Design a protein around this ligand. Sequence first.
Ligand SMILES: CC(=O)N[C@H]1[C@H](O[C@@H]2[C@H](O)[C@@H](O)[C@H](O[C@H]3[C@H](O)[C@@H](O)[C@H](O)O[C@@H]3CO)O[C@@H]2CO)O[C@H](CO)[C@H](O)[C@@H]1O
Length: 581
Amino acid sequence: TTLGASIGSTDFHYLQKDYDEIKKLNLNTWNEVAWIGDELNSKIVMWTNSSPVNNVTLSSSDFINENGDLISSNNIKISWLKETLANIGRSNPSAPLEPFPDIIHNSGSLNIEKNKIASAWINIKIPRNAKPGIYNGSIEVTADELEKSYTFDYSFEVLNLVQPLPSETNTQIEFWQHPYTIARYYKICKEDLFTEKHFKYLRGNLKEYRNMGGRGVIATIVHEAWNHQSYDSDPSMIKWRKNSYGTFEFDYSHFDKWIQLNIDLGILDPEKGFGQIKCYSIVPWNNRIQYFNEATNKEEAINPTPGSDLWINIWTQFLTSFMSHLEEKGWFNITYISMNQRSMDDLKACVDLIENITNNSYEHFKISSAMDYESGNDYSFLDRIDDISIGLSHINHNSDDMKNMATHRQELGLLTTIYTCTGDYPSSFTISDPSEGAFTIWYSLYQNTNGFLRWSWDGWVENPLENVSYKYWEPGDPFLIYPAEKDSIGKTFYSTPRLEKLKEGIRDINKAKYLMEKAPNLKNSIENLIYSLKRPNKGENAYGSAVAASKEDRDLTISEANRIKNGINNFAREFISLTME
Ligand SMILES: CC(=O)N[C@H]1[C@H](O[C@@H]2[C@H](O)[C@@H](O)[C@H](O[C@H]3[C@H](O)[C@@H](O)[C@H](O)O[C@@H]3CO)O[C@@H]2CO)O[C@H](CO)[C@H](O)[C@@H]1O
């Protein structure tokens, strides 16, 4: 024909290079299991031949159960997956530059060049007041050059249990946001920073974060704290100045507006002790603190070594001032001072200083850190850090070091997460299989942590919608959402399949934690299922990017994700049965 069509997996990308392989698909039916308030995703893959094809459109019926309960077609959003270019290597500028369908772009029609793949993401939101049962419906695909329409048989079962709202779970999610990057992309001026004109491009993507379970909000407290690793500079949200007497003063304006925005959006609730403010960092890159010297009237920097007399002096000034400031705002209880991977000497100097500065109630700042922990059961220092996150590449699957460490922390009421970054596999890159994200989240629970941290909400390059290639890291590493087009009406961001799979993983670990809690009798059955998870092997492509070791390892990430999900849905059904009989 002029146009071919088939249901396809959301687990991996359908790429142009796989054209000839893809044209041989003909999957016409789809079924899945969801809870009330849950979501489901699917995909239809289309193709063209010698001739191009205009105005390709897809559309969805209403969905109806056996009691004629309705889920409107408006809960089904079908979006073209837009392709963007990606250098497939890591700091390898001569690596091949290939298209990946990494963007959940727009609804409506689309043209398709000769001999091309195009795919459309399908997202189904089950309303929070939906009735249980088996729902059926269909999705149609048509075009202009086609005098016919293809048809696709979709059903799904809603189980009689309500997907927990994020605030009803104990899942920890922290994605680092870069609000100045949002300002740069959308040409927000210096003077409009953290005003309503800025907030308009932040609210949507922050709501999105909140709704998938985000609780951590990063705030920079010194300038360029990651040495400009990213496309955009990282300004400090707290401006430092040295006055004529030679003591430091701090301007909290940006920090205050940023945090207040996050309080207004419900990510943070400092009165109720919810959410975290992560202050980056007491160990910024090379210990460098840049400041305006009012005396010499110029910009200067210092680089004092942790533990040194100058260091203790300066951070004592900041921490003391910051604590008082946060106490007047009522924010102090949810505030953490962040560290990062440093020498044990630097880390101990930090924890020792921080612990030594207290308010009237002898409360000190909480402390948060990426740590490299991989073995041994000496927790005495690690327990003085209130939130830690461990890179997946430092977690040894052939041991229970990580899980034992995490379990100790849960007992003491401390937070623990894992993260992925450059060099990790599974991970959440543009070139990753999106299923890897669901796996990652399940791995956080397999390790008995509270959840997942990633550095990379929104660190856009110049024009990521067209090319995400950046000089460091696997492509797409620095962002899980895309921006909208600069002229958008409109939308302020687009989601990605990789992010939707993180979201799936999170909802699905939330189902498992909910069951464990509400059906104590199923708990060890569930725990055993979780603890059966296998870990695929990390390989590396010809150009420096981490990837799956082999086809077997790709398949395992998918099979394992689905296995566990299904297992949990069966436990779901067991609990539901119990209630009915
Ligand atoms: C939490 C997070 O994602 N942080 C980084 C992330 O960095 C990874 C890890 O957290 C770092 O400790 C490590 O940093 C350096 C390492 O400790 C040094 O011994 C070595 O000489 O240089 C390392 C820098 O490569 O780096 C790893 C990643 O390689 O990585 C992401 C990029 O995906 C961002 O840089 C986050 O800021």
